[PDB]
Amino acid sequence: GFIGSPTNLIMVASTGACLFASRFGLAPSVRKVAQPLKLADREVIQTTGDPAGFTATDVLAMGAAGHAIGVGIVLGLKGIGQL
Amino acid sequence: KVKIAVDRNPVETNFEKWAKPGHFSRALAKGPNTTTWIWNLHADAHDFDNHTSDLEEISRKVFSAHFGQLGIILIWLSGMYFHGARFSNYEGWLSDPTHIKPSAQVVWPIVGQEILNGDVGGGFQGIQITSGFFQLWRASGITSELQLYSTAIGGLVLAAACFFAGWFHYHKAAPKLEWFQNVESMLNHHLAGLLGLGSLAWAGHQIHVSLPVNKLLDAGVDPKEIPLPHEFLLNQSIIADLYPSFSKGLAPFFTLNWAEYSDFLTFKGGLNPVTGGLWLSDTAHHHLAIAVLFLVAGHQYRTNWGIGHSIKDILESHKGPFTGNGHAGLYEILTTSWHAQLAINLALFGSLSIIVAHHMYAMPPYPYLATDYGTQLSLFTHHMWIGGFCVVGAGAHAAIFMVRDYDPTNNYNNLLDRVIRHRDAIISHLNWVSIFLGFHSFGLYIHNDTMSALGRPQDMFSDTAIQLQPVFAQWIQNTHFTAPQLTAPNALAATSLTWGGDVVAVGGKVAMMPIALGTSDFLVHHIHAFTIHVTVLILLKGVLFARSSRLIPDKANLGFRFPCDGPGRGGTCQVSAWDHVFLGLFWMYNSLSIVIFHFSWKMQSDVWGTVTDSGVSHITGGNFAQSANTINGWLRDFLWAQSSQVIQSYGSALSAYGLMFLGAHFVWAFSLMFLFSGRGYWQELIESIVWAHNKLRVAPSIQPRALSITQGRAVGVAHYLLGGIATTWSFFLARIIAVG
Amino acid sequence: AGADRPLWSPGSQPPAWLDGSLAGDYGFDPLHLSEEPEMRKWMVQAELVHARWAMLGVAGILFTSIAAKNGAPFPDWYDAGKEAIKTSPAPLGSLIFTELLLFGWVETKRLYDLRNPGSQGDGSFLGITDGLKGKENGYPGGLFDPMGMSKNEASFKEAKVKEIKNGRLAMLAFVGFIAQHHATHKSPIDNLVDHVADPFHVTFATNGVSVPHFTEF
Amino acid sequence: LYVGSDAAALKYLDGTLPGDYGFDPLGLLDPTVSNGQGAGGFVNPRWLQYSEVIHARWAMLGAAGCIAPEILGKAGVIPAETAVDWFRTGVIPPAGVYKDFWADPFTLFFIEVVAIQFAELKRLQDYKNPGSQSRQYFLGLEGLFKGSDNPAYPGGPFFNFANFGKTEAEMKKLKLNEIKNGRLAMLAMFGYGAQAVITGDGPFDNLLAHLADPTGANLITNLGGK
Amino acid sequence: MKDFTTYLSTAPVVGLGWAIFTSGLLIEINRFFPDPLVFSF
Numbered sequence A: 001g002f003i004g005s006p007t008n009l010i011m012v013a014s015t016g017a018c019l020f021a022s023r024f025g026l027a028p029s030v031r032k033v034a035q036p037l038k039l040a041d042r043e044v045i046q047t048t049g050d051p052a053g054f055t056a057t058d059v060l061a062m063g064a065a066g067h068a069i070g071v072g073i074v075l076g077l078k079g080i081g082q083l
Numbered sequence B: 001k002v003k004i005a006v007d008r009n010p011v012e013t014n015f016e017k018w019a020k021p022g023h024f025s026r027a028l029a030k031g032p033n034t035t036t037w038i039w040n041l042h043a044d045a046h047d048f049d050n051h052t053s054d055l056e057e058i059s060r061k062v063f064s065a066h067f068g069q070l071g072i073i074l075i076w077l078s079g080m081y082f083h084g085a086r087f088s089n090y091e092g093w094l095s096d097p098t099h100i101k102p103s104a105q106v107v108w109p110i111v112g113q114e115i116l117n118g119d120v121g122g123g124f125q126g127i128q129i130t131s132g133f134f135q136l137w138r139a140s141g142i143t144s145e146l147q148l149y150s151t152a153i154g155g156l157v158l159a160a161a162c163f164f165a166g167w168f169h170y171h172k173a174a175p176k177l178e179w180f181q182n183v184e185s186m187l188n189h190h191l192a193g194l195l196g197l198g199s200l201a202w203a204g205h206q207i208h209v210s211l212p213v214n215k216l217l218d219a220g221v222d223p224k225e226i227p228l229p230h231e232f233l234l235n236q237s238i239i240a241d242l243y244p245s246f247s248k249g250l251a252p253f254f255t256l257n258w259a260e261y262s263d264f265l266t267f268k269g270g271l272n273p274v275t276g277g278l279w280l281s282d283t284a285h286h287h288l289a290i291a292v293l294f295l296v297a298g299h300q301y302r303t304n305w306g307i308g309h310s311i312k313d314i315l316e317s318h319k320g321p322f323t324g325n326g327h328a329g330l331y332e333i334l335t336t337s338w339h340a341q342l343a344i345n346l347a348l349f350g351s352l353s354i355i356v357a358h359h360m361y362a363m364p365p366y367p368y369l370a371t372d373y374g375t376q377l378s379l380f381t382h383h384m385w386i387g388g389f390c391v392v393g394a395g396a397h398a399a400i401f402m403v404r405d406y407d408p409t410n411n412y413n414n415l416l417d418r419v420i421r422h423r424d425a426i427i428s429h430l431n432w433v434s435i436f437l438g439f440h441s442f443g444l445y446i447h448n449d450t451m452s453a454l455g456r457p458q459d460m461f462s463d464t465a466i467q468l469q470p471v472f473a474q475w476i477q478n479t480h481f482t483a484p485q486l487t488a489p490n491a492l493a494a495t496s497l498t499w500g501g502d503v504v505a506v507g508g509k510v511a512m513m514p515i516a517l518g519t520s521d522f523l524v525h526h527i528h529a530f531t532i533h534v535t536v537l538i539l540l541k542g543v544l545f546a547r548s549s550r551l552i553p554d555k556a557n558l559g560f561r562f563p564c565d566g567p568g569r570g571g572t573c574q575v576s577a578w579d580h581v582f583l584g585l586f587w588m589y590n591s592l593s594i595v596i597f598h599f600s601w602k603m604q605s606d607v608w609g610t611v612t613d614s615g616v617s618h619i620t621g622g623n624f625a626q627s628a629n630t631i632n633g634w635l636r637d638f639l640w641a642q643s644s645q646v647i648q649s650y651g652s653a654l655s656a657y658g659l660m661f662l663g664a665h666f667v668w669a670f671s672l673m674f675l676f677s678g679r680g681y682w683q684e685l686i687e688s689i690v691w692a693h694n695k696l697r698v699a700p701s702i703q704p705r706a707l708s709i710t711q712g713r714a715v716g717v718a719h720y721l722l723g724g725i726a727t728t729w730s731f732f733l734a735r736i737i738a739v740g
Numbered sequence C: 001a002g003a004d005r006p007l008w009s010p011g012s013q014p015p016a017w018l019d020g021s022l023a024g025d026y027g028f029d030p031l032h033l034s035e036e037p038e039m040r041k042w043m044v045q046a047e048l049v050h051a052r053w054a055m056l057g058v059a060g061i062l063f064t065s066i067a068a069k070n071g072a073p074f075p076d077w078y079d080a081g082k083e084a085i086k087t088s089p090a091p092l093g094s095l096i097f098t099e100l101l102l103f104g105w106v107e108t109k110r111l112y113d114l115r116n117p118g119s120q121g122d123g124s125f126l127g128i129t130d131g132l133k134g135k136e137n138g139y140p141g142g143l144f145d146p147m148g149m150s151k152n153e154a155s156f157k158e159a160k161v162k163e164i165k166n167g168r169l170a171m172l173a174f175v176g177f178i179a180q181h182h183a184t185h186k187s188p189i190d191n192l193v194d195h196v197a198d199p200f201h202v203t204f205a206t207n208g209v210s211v212p213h214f215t216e217f
Numbered sequence D: 001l002y003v004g005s006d007a008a009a010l011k012y013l014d015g016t017l018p019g020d021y022g023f024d025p026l027g028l029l030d031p032t033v034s035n036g037q038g039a040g041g042f043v044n045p046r047w048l049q050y051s052e053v054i055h056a057r058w059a060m061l062g063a064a065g066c067i068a069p070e071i072l073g074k075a076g077v078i079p080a081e082t083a084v085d086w087f088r089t090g091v092i093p094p095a096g097v098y099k100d101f102w103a104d105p106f107t108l109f110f111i112e113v114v115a116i117q118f119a120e121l122k123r124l125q126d127y128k129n130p131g132s133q134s135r136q137y138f139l140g141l142e143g144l145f146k147g148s149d150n151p152a153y154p155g156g157p158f159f160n161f162a163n164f165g166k167t168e169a170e171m172k173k174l175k176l177n178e179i180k181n182g183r184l185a186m187l188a189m190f191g192y193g194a195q196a197v198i199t200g201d202g203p204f205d206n207l208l209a210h211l212a213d214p215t216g217a218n219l220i221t222n223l224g225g226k
Numbered sequence E: 001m002k003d004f005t006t007y008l009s010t011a012p013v014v015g016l017g018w019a020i021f022t023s024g025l026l027i028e029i030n031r032f033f034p035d036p037l038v039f040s041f
């Protein structure tokens, strides 16, 4: 919440890591399918200038995932007495 | 892919089909000629699978019928709120809930029934209600009758809106088959919106309205002097005084410092000593966590945006080596058959109702709910019976799906085919398990009764002679008593008082206390398991042998609901799956009757009572440890020791319970003539009456006929269930109101 | 007198049974009543008698209230029966049953003229043949129309339209009488003077009824 | 440019609508949705466009009526007692009610509901039956209610008495600008309601607070964050 | 109207009408004649 707080830093890092994972393979996305690996799919939604398969629902889903991972990490570290 | 598919005006709103009673089926479209047509009019009314073979029309009818049932439910809820608004002493009950009985039904003085308006207290006369609506309204922050009036008017408005919605979504804008088949969208919207959004809205109401009103009520201030909920909503000074964390003003939520919300979102597991109910802050954090979990779960399935899970892909992927085609054709089955979904919904709804009853007697989630013993007993019994009816209807509609909607082409080597392929082994093993359970439980009871009648108390299976103590249940109780100690250290106390601890009492009456488990408890628990096993065996034999059997190889062609196949092969009476459900209904009734008898006796002997300086004096003095081990103990110390209030209720406000008890005995006895006998006797009797009316030239044009064998069985089981249910209802309510 | 006639709502489709022949036919029928010709005749007769009694009662109420406001000792239209049989030579019971006996003849003659048109004017009642014959469904005429301005067809139609419009207006006037006497407990003329004295303040919203006041803020 | 146009949504809509930026993620302009005859459901393209333009006009009027009193009362144009916040006029008596009015607020509500019921019921009857309000005599202004083929743009001697847009290009530009300003005012009234709930002040006061201190007065600082 | 009238002319609806009529008649008789047992004019 506070600018410069450790929770802000690590949750911004988590959201950016989720976005970077969605941009380049890694995390499954709209254009990524199949259970074991990730395979190319239909474009589904126009990306509106974004290269590769990166649409609005992609950034919405992975921002939600990043916020969830960040709040889980924050509360887990607060439970164990860490940052 | 997922989109709204709606046809515009497929059915015109005309009264021309209201004049013709039999119109949905071609068999009844020809008009009536015998009286068995009339029953057939009231039997195939909701059999939409038989009226048309088109799944789209059936789905539209199902949607409209669900809207109608929601409208009926909202009408009933609005009427309940209106009765609480006008013909009730809720305002008087709020001043002293431990001395004024809850009353919300008032009778008209016409023929001497005004004696039913008993002295409930607070300057009011009426019937002592056991629904617990007073405690629900106290948990919702309702103070004045104006709020109940507003809730009733809003309920009537929403009921009219739902009734118009059913008319619109059937006659005007009827959804197509592709709209109903979007199971992924339905699941996502139900998990996120129906359950999660409602949980979040109720959590917000508990935070902003229910918690301050309940805190001020527990403080002991006048309910008339309590500020209105909108004052808590708008002005922040009162909510800051009652809870300092509200002075932050949503700062800890968006800064992830949620521990600052710990004052009004607590984890003090247990019972509130002021009111004997669950902590409202605990319920607020509970519903908030449930809402968060359900909004997380509602984004699981793929609908229109690529990401998500496919139900068909998940079902086809989960295949093992011992099962062949693991869960292969189930997605096509559950997206085309309404009866399979009905069976699933009814089974899960009934099991969840049983869970609700158990976890509601265990933790009373309402202020001044545990002190009202009658409310708790009535709620437990009601949810118990509704759950049992739902789980037997699950087997009924599963058998209906087996007869009608099963396709062998889509089921070659899948799980359903293998279940049908070893159904005989399933039924044989279940029969052996049921017989062994019934022997080693009921024969144990008979052993105790015999050795009691033979003067051998040391030979009995009691708490003093042969200790067959429930060591697993006692170990689990001890572990859950230590759950806040080591495994859940953030909880202030135990999650419930049933595991152990101290005695919580309100107004001199014990709200909750630890429950000891002995040999009688083990005996009745194994008896319940045996009865459930037998009912499961009956319903599973009905479901699995619904299509074919060794006795009848072409049972599928005879339909789901047929009386018999003649006296051939020795006799094929009651061989249909419908007759199996009709037989299992009695076993469900017996099982739940024994369960509620165990609940009533155990909580009257070891839970409920009064609290004095010497200790806790229970209602029956704790005879369950020494009387529940024999059938004669239930006969004398539970059925004869109680039920004296029912028979002595004449001349008082409880006399309607005695009259209802007698009427229930009457209906239960009257059911036996339909359960026994047959059809030819009554048919010839009706022929003689036809001759009598023909002598006087008053023979009706519609030929009177005897009830069908299936119809006679249905009438018998319905009157039998109604008689037994109302007998237990009257006995329980009269006993728990007079002495409770 | 039909087809392109002003309706209750501009653009709404008029009902098939409401062709505009009847007086005051604005095609107003949300519940689709009076579809059958016999049901239409019964509804027309009921509307006509309700209209005549409503206009008579509203005129009497207005005259009594105007005289009371002018200074004449007349009671309010509400609870006038109490002082009425307090000062009546005829007590209650006898008066209402005498009224019922006097009304039964007229009501049953109206009913059997509605069921059988022209059957009353056959000399059965004091040898009257030309009179006591219904000119129309709900419009008897004869001795009930002493002066003959209903002989002209166009004049009769205009009189029917005027009568049904003033009847509907008097129906709403009587409903308003009941409503604002239950709301204000004053005479309708008192409500009229209060409305024309301070129109900007005195209205249906300042009586303490109709609109509820809970928070008072 | 198409502002965030979702793919597979252009398959059923071409460029005929004024805005028509191709943004339809869930999908409601599809002719397959509510296809048939008669009244049908409420999700049809004609009613969708009609409700969109009516929401646009109402939101534009609301944004104007929320800005003008506060802005003119900040200066000497509007006196201070009449320069109340838009939610403190009496629309929400918990928020605030202006007692010094020429009539009671419920009397004004009754006059308003009668007038707007006449207006919107005539509008609805013309929507169901085009040109029907010009036939039945209303006051003599029936020729002013002639309407057009599109119910969203009736025109006539009163609704468009300036007869702007003689050419089709000017009609298209005017319709696009109307729907754009209406969508902007819809988002504006959304923000106005949000600020009224959170800040409890007028939108111009919130704008001045953001202007004076950007970081010290923003959405993050509104709810307690830093 | 006539279709709704024939719906009201069906046996359950007229039976319901008879039920309310008879029940209301007996209830009003019992209310205005409180608890009689023997016919004594």
Ligand code: CLA
Binding pocket: B062, B063, B064, B066, B067, B070, B162, B179, B180, B182, B183, B185, B186, B189, B190, B192, B193, B194
């Ligand atoms: C998040 C959105 C949402 C919500 C809240 C609901 C809610 C509901 N659905 Mg629905 N459903 C949805 C989306 C949603 N649906 C979608 C997208 C589909 C298509 C895939 C379906 C398909 C569907 C079927 C096929 C059926 C339901 C049924 C039901 C009801 C279940 C009974 C119950 O729990 O009573 C809860 C009751 C209440 C809480 C009382 C208030 C109910 C209000 C009026 C509903 C308001 C939510 C509504 C969806 C808003 C949109 C409607 C709007 C145009 C007016 C419930 C009202 C069943 C039904 O017909 O019930 C009538 C049923 O058989 N749903």
Ligand code: CLA
Binding pocket: B200, B201, B203, B204, B205, B207, B208, B232, B233, B234, B236, B239, B245, B246, B247, B248, B249, B250, B253, B261, B265, B288, D062, D189, D190, D191, D192, D193, D194, D195, D197, D198
């Ligand atoms: C569904 C549940 C729910 C609801 C309705 C509320 C609602 C509220 N809570 Mg609560 N709260 C909740 C859950 C909920 N909360 C939960 C789960 C927690 C976690 C512990 C809290 C914790 C909490 C705290 C600690 C506090 C509140 C406060 C508030 C108020 C502030 C609202 C606000 O700023 O939000 C944001 C609201 C908006 C952005 C407004 C929505 C946008 C509007 C509606 C747009 C309208 C536009 C429209 C078109 C124009 C108007 C139309 C008109 C012209 C006709 C409000 C009454 C605070 C309070 O009471 O002080 C005032 C407070 O101190 N709540």
Ligand code: CLA
Binding pocket: B431, B434, B435, B436, B437, B438, B439, B442, B443, B446, B530, B534, B537, B538, B583, B584, B586, B587
């Ligand atoms: C109290 C009466 C009674 C009794 C004893 C039984 C007994 C039985 N029924 Mg049931 N049943 C009853 C009433 C009863 N029924 C009624 C009223 C209905 C109508 C709804 C049904 C409907 C019904 C169905 C639908 C089914 C059964 C089944 C069964 C069997 C389950 C075996 C078991 O678990 O217990 C074991 C048996 C006992 C505990 C009997 C008690 C007697 C003593 C303890 C046994 C020893 C006696 C003595 C020591 C030996 C004497 C030897 C010599 C002198 C004769 C068993 C034969 C099921 C079945 O076939 O098997 C699973 C089944 O599917 N019954």
Ligand SMILES: CC1=C(/C=C/C(C)=C\C=C/C(C)=C/C=C/C=C(C)/C=C/C=C(C)/C=C/C2=C(C)CCCC2(C)C)C(C)(C)CCC1
Binding pocket: A015, A059, A060, A061, A062, A063, A064, A065, A067, A068, A071, B292
């Ligand atoms: C590179 C680039 C760029 C940038 C971009 C960006 C920077 C973005 C971002 C984005 C973002 C940054 C987003 C986010 C989102 C988020 C979200 C969506 C989240 C969440 C939500 C919610 C609603 C939540 C909830 C919750 C709660 C409350 C509780 C529980 C848990 C959770 C967390 C789940 C640009 C354009 C310039 C250019 C080009 C490229």
Ligand SMILES: CC1=C(C/C=C(\C)CCC[C@H](C)CCC[C@H](C)CCCC(C)C)C(=O)c2ccccc2C1=O
Binding pocket: B673, B674, B675, B676, B677, B678, B679, B682, B705, B706, B707, B708, B709, B711, B712, B713
């Ligand atoms: C008695 C009996 C009959 C005969 C029962 C018949 C014909 C049903 C009679 C139902 C009556 C007509 C219901 C209505 C009774 C009253 C006339 C209605 C209430 C009257 C009061 C309100 C005055 C069967 O047909 C039968 C069939 C199969 C198994 C068992 C039996 C069985 O036991």
